From a paper:
Plant pathogens secrete proteins, known as effectors, that function in the apoplast or inside plant cells to promote virulence. Previous studies of Fol-infected tomato identified a number of fungal proteins within the xylem sap. These secreted in xylem (SIX) effector proteins represent major pathogenicity determinants across different formae speciales of F. oxysporum. Currently, 14 SIX effectors have been identified in Fol consisting of small (less than 300 amino acids in length), secreted, cysteine-rich proteins. Here, we demonstrate that despite their sequence diversity, the Fol SIX effectors can be classified into a reduced set of structural families.
Author numbering:
A (entry chain C): 29 to 46
B (entry chain A): 58 to 226
The structure:
Amino acid sequence: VAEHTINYIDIAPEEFEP
Amino acid sequence: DTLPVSTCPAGQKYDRSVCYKADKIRSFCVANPRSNREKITDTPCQPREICVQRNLSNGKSFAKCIPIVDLVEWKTSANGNKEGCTTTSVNPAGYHHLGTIVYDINKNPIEVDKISYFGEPGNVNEGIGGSTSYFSSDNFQFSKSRYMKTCIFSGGYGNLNAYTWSWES
């Protein structure tokens, strides 16, 4: 098992990543 | 939650953003032709956020602040020449990246000799980057049985402050 669990996934806004 | 500033003077366009400090985004406008009048904008993070950085699908740097509670904060090995690691699941199951950025005690990004990612179980190579303050993994299929180990080899100073977050494009 992993030491940590991430529950938030970042996505760049469209205005920066078209 | 804190985003870089995308607005630019007339005649200028937003080009990229970087973590200037652990708590300060810096955005860059560019003119055509390039000039020294180009607007550079520093945006402070809120005190509970940390600045994280990665390269977008177009190769441009992109920086923003994420609450530290929403990512993994860890220390690199006390001995700068010892590779140290941490392991992370990501919810929900699916294809995600990890990114990692490293800061020194003065909140400046610090280049490390190697950041490497291993899919687990199996120690599957999920990306190796070098001489860089930040680096992102391949797109990896996380699940209740699949997780990712991140390893930092500083090669210089130890006890550095690392931040590992998840992202998709």
